[PDB]
Every structure is written in C-alpha cells, then in structure tokens.
Design a protein around this ligand. Structure first.
Ligand code: PRO
Lengths: 31, 296
C-alpha cells in the first residue's frame, strides 16, 4: 500500500518539511 | 505528506465530543438527585488527592492504581456516574500535567504509567481522555491553525487572563508542554504484564511519530514557539524510546525537527527552538538524557 514515492523517502538519508510520511515506517524499512 | 483536511476533521471530531460530553453527562448530573450527588462528592474528593501522592516509587505507583480502581469500580454499575467520574479523572490527569508536570517534568513518568493503566482497565476513558487532550492541546494530533483571530486562539487551547486579554505566553506554553509530556510518556511505555498479551496499547508509539511528522508538515506561517516547546517536552520524555522504536527513521525525523525546523524559524528567536537545538546537540554528542528510572 506504500507508494513508491514514500518508499523512496524512507530510503533517503533525510526527510523534508511538508513531505514527512504521516504513518511511521514498518520494521522492514528501519535499518 | 500530511492531509490537513483529515487532521482538521479529526480535531473537530474531538471538539464535537467535548460538546457531547457537556450536554449528555454534565447537565444530567447537575439536574440529578441529592443523595447521589453527595456520594459522588465523597468519591470526587476521595479520588483527587491520589494523583499528587505519586512518587518515583513503583510500590507507591501500584498502591495508587489499586485505590483509584476500587473507587472507579464503585460507579461501574451506574452509567451516568461512571462516565461522569471518568470525565473527572481525565480532567484531573490533564490538570496535573498542566500544573505539577510543568514544574517537575520527570513527574510525567509515574503519571503516564498510572494513566496508561487506567486507560486499559477502563477503556471508556480513552475517548474522554483523548478528547480532553485534543481540546486543551491540539498539538497531540498535529492540528495547527492561525492564532491571529480570537476563534483561532480558542481552538488552540488559549485561556483568558480577563475580558479581552489572553493568558501570557509563558503560562500557555508551559501548560502545553506539561500535557504533551504526559502523553509522550504514555506513547513510549509498554503495557504492564497483566495486559500486554491480551490488550493492544491504546496510545502506542506510532502516535508520537504522528506528532513530529504533522508538525514538520505544517505550513511554516502557522508554527509558533509552542510547537518547539511541546517538541522539547516530548523529547525529554520519549526521544530515547523513539529511537529504539524507529532507528534510522526516527533519527531522520529528530534531525528534521532539531536542525531544519529550528533553522527555518531562526529569526523568530523562539526560546523553545533554542532549547530544541540544545537537545539535538546533546544527542549529536552522545549525551541524550532520559528521565531516571523509577526506584524500588
Ligand atoms: O500504491 C500506489 O498506488 C502507489 C502509486 C505509485 C506507486 N505506488
């Protein structure tokens, strides 16, 4: 259900104001 | 990204619930019989001192949990009295966050533990408590509106000093920080062993993610010192455990609030922003603090 754009944001080394995913990452996306 | 229409809809849901609490519970009790009002007065003031008797001691925590549960159970048969007392408890817990946690932030730890326990033992309390938190402190769900108009001030939980003078900024900010401190604690505590296999945590760590994300997604023209205050109160209460929960993703979000958000508002010289940057710096220097563990 996670958009590819959200997956890209979780893969990035940073978030940006206005673009933080509202829903926390599942464990698979935490390093 | 955040959909601010849904957060606004969520805000006005809890605001409508506060209004529903007044009509469907408070006035019924005002129009009610005397012998029951006396019993609830005896119960109302037998309950209020318990929250202040909390200490840093787990043994003392368990005592207060037990004594409040017996008093709430005294009303369990009687729906109007039961919901009236839970509304009172929810108000008293928030009031404690506004007053005692404000002066002694670490006191949010025992109070959060007590509240989380009451929230699963008596789950009608969850909606009453969350409605009271959102009404008094809309930051708990990431709601922000302009406070230039009188209506906006009211929505964001400001009180009146008198006729047409708002409460001073320090009073409001310190109340918001104390309330959010308590909620922050609750989101990062684990359920006691008696519930953890049987019950979902009613206000889990995801709700702390929502707060930070939604504030970071809020139009910057609506950010005020209070956002930074509650984020610093949140940090002192839960940053260690937030990192445990979400690791590198938590870290990106802490950097976003502590470096980027403070930088973007730097010319406002918000006192809360300066403190949040100090907390970021302590973490960057491998010196992040947490409230001391409770003693035996
Ligand atoms: O779930 C979706 O529909 C999103 C759209 C872009 C790729 N994944």
């Amino acid at each position: 259900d996670l958009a590819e754009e959200t997956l890209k944001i979780f893969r990035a080394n940073k978030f940006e104001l206005g673009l933080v995913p509202d829903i926390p990452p599942p464990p698979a996306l935490v390093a | 990204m955040t959909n601010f229409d849904k957060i606004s809809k969520m805000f006005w849901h809890y605001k409508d619930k506060i209004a529903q609490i007044k009509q469907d519970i408070v006035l019924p009790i005002k129009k009610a019989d005397v012998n029951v009002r006396n019993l609830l007065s005896r119960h109302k003031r037998k309950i209020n001192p318990k929250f202040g008797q909390l200490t840093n001691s787990n043994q003392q925590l368990f005592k207060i949990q037990n004594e409040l549960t017996q008093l709430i159970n005294d009303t369990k048969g009687d729906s109007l009295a039961y919901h009236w007392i839970l509304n009172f408890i929810a108000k008293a817990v928030v009031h404690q966050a506004e007053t005692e946690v404000r002066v002694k932030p670490e006191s949010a730890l025992p109070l959060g533990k007590l509240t989380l326990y009451l929230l699963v033992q008596f789950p009608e309390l969850q909606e009453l408590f969350m409605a009271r938190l959102v009404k008094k402190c809309p930051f708990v769900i990431g709601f922000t509106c302009e406070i230039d108009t009188e209506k906006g001030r009211q929505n964001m939980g400001w009180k009146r000093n008198n006729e047409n003078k708002w409460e001073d900024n320090t009073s409001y900010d310190e109340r918001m920080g104390g309330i959010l401190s308590l909620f922050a604690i609750i989101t990062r505590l684990q359920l006691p062993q008696e519930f953890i296999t049987t019950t979902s945590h009613p206000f889990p760590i995801a709700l702390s993610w929502h707060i930070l994300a939604r504030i970071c997604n809020t139009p910057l023209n609506l950010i005020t010192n209070t956002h930074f205050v509650i984020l610093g109160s949140w940090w002192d209460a839960a940053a260690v455990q937030f990192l445990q929960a979400y690791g590198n993703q938590a870290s990106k979000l802490l950097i976003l609030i502590g470096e980027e958000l403070t930088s973007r508002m730097a010319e406002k010289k918000y006192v809360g922003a300066a403190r949040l940057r100090i907390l970021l710096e302590a973490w960057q220097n491998n010196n992040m603090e947490s409230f001391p563990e409770m003693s035996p």
